[PDB]
């Protein structure tokens, strides 16, 4: 028994040495001569005033105009950002909701939470209403994230330390990803939707392969739980947000950490992470009731988004990069620009 | 300056707003009770006399109760316990006969200490049930309570032993100026537990409404 336990330890030490010989220079030295972005002032442009409880998730449509939000009052609401109008209001069977997704084609939305079930809703019906298209069951822990690949596939992340890839037309798990040791709290699909990353409560992140269902790489370094994760727009790096009040930038090809986004004035954890269209600004939401803007390439702090009266729980940036939306534990969303 | 189609959209949005407000009032007249307990608390029992999450809706004397049971959640409590910040009260069940099994009472005491002084339930009243009192008063004359509480001083009689256990549980409430604990020795397997929950909930409701507008 200990022979395998010893071999696993020395093999782990070999990896740590192998990826140390590749760290000849840091990102700070390389980007030590470029001009800083300066100071970023973002004014609030809209405020969405429909929910009656805490808002837990949101997602943008690929047309950069519609978005869906979920709150614990049991409603999904689809907003029109430009006019602030409400397009749809969907009543959920269970009000314990913690995730939300919008299909890339725009025909469906997804939802899930403490009921261990992911529900697919059909938006474009001949009868004029919104119907539950499918209910996916099989997870033994709460649903914490879900993301569409296309109209027939979806990846879900659960609190039973597993991720799964479904088939909506049939309702079965095509593949199961079983590597983690704690609850999996976040999820992010690559730009080409060929592979994805997940962050769990064992203070590690893993890089999965959708086609073969195996773990490629494991990234460590955080001292506590991981709550948020996001790919760089290039598709060759990603960022994580943790409860130790620190964001980190990992690199797939170099296979270790690059930057740490921390300061002595922040002591609260991160709830959400997102990039800008160019990959130059990193936006992070905190429990301080406000969002921070980081110069992702120099680790400076460039601005603040302080307009909320409670914790900021979700955060997203449009596909054309024109705006940022933040939901919070008060019942308001805000569009910043 | 709006179009002809651009105004029917606003009318639809206003009707959606109206229905949202109307639905937010039917759900504000119900009492939400989170139902905690030890490992062998007896959640099924608490259901009988009175996947993931399990709900239960009933009605007593024109009052509507929703009772959430979270015994099936095997995950980490600190990730989903903030979802229940805002319930009217918490029902905590303790078996009085679990002072000899293995020690087992100390786990209940630790769980009560964790829940009572949690940072989310800082102003949520707790209704404490002490079940199985018949077994407690039958066993107490064959196994001294000093097994679970060495520092006991009283005698092997149910009347003072039960009071000592109740005091030990109530002493774990640190902030005795914002939270109240209602204790009930549930037994007789009849409609005396629903009545106690009703009384405690009306008291909680009155004090909450008073606390909103100063007064407290």
């Amino acid at each position: 028994l200990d022979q395998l336990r010893q071999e696993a330890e020395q093999l782990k030490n070999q990896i740590r040495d192998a990826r140390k010989a590749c760290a000849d220079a840091t990102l700070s030295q390389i980007t030590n001569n470029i001009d800083p972005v300066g100071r970023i002032q973002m004014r609030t442009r809209r405020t969405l005033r429909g929910h009656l409880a805490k808002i837990y998730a949101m997602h943008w449509g690929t047309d950069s105009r519609l978005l869906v939000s979920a709150s614990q009052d049991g409603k999904l609401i689809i907003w029109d950002s430009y006019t602030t109008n409400k397009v749809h209001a969907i009543p959920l069977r269970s009000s314990w909701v913690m995730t939300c997704a919008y299909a890339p084609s725009g025909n469906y939305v997804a939802c899930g939470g403490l009921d261990n079930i992911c529900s697919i809703y059909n938006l474009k019906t001949r009868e004029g209403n919104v119907r539950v298209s499918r209910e996916l069951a099989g997870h033994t822990g709460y649903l914490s994230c879900c993301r569409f690949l296309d109209d027939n596939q979806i990846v879900t992340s659960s609190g039973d330390t597993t991720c799964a890839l479904w088939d909506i037309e049939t309702g079965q798990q095509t593949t199961t990803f079983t590597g983690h040791t704690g609850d999996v709290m976040s999820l992010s699909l690559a730009p080409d939707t060929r592979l994805f990353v997940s962050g769990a409560c064992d203070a590690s992140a893993k890089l999965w392969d959708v086609r073969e269902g195996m773990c490629r790489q494991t990234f460590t370094g955080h001292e506590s739980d991981i709550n948020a994760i996001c790919f760089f727009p290039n598709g060759n790096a990603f960022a994580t947000g943790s409860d130790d009040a620190t964001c980190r930038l990992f690199d797939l090809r170099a296979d270790q950490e690059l930057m740490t986004y921390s300061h002595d004035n922040i002591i609260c954890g991160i709830t959400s992470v997102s990039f800008s269209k160019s990959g130059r600004l990193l936006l992070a939401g905190y429990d301080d009731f406000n969002c921070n803007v980081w110069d992702a390439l120099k680790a400076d702090r460039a601005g603040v988004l302080a307009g909320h009266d409670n914790r900021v729980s979700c955060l997203g940036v449009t596909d054309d990069g024109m705006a940022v939306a933040t939901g919070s534990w008060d019942s308001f969303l805000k569009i910043w620009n | 300056t709006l179009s002809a189609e651009d105004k029917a959209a606003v009318e639809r949005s206003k009707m959606i707003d109206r229905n949202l407000r109307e639905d937010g009032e039917k759900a504000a007249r119900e009492v939400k009770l989170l139902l905690l307990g030890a490992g062998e608390s007896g959640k099924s029992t608490i259901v009988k006399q009175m996947t993931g999450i399990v709900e239960t809706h009933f009605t007593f004397k024109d009052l509507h109760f929703k009772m959430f049971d979270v015994g099936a959640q095997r995950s980490e409590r600190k990730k989903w316990i903030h979802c229940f910040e805002g319930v009217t009260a918490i029902i905590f069940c303790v078996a009085l006969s679990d002072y000899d099994l293995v020690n087992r009472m100390h786990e209940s005491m630790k769980l009560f200490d964790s829940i009572c002084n949690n940072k989310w339930f800082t102003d949520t009243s707790i209704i404490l049930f002490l079940n199985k009192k018949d077994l407690f008063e039958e066993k107490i004359k064959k196994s001294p309570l000093t097994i679970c509480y060495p520092e006991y001083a009283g005698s092997n009689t149910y009347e003072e032993a039960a009071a000592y256990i109740q005091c030990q549980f109530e002493d774990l409430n640190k902030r005795k100026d914002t939270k109240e604990i209602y204790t009930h020795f549930t037994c007789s397997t009849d409609t005396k537990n629903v009545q106690f929950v009703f009384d405690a909930v009306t008291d909680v409701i009155i004090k909450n409404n008073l606390k909103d507008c100063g007064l407290f």
Partner: single-chain antibody
Amino acid sequence: DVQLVESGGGLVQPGGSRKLSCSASGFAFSSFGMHWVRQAPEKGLEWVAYISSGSGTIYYADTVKGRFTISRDDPKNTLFLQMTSLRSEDTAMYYCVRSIYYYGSSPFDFWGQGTTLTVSSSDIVMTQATSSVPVTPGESVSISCRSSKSLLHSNGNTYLYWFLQRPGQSPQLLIYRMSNLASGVPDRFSGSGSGTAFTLTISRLEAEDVGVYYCMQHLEYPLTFGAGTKLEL
């Protein structure tokens, strides 16, 4: 199965009164606004009235305002048109049309089946200069419609609609807002054009495409139609 069935027509004396009904079945009737559209015995379509969802908004044409009254009964899924003092110019066939308005919706998408009424004896002008064209199957033809005012609004939308009425049938939506293709319509139909000049293009024309094509504007009330272009042969 989204059918709208309607009845109440017949022969009525001039100066009389009548009531028409439209009983819906197979869709969320409460969420759709409803229209009445009138089509004279050998003429083009003509808008009549409109009632919103929730009955909070009602419009009438100038020809019928003060005489007609539109109402709905949501629990029973029924649409009414109470009409009094009928002239000899009201003999026509009346259609029941549903339409729902939100961002990206498709108004005027389903039409009723028609009940015939016979009675014993500024507005935007939409122009369709051509009256009839002979068409050979397998070819391509274009139909033009012209407006007296710019249909392009400040928000970027051009409110032009194209309908097709096959012989002895109800009109069917083809294109909404000048570019979008209605669901269930083959891809060989396409629409284009700028303000005050529009065109409908059909490629590889074949059977079941003969009929009359109408262009309607939805920029402001009252809604107005074109005279219609007929494809034969």
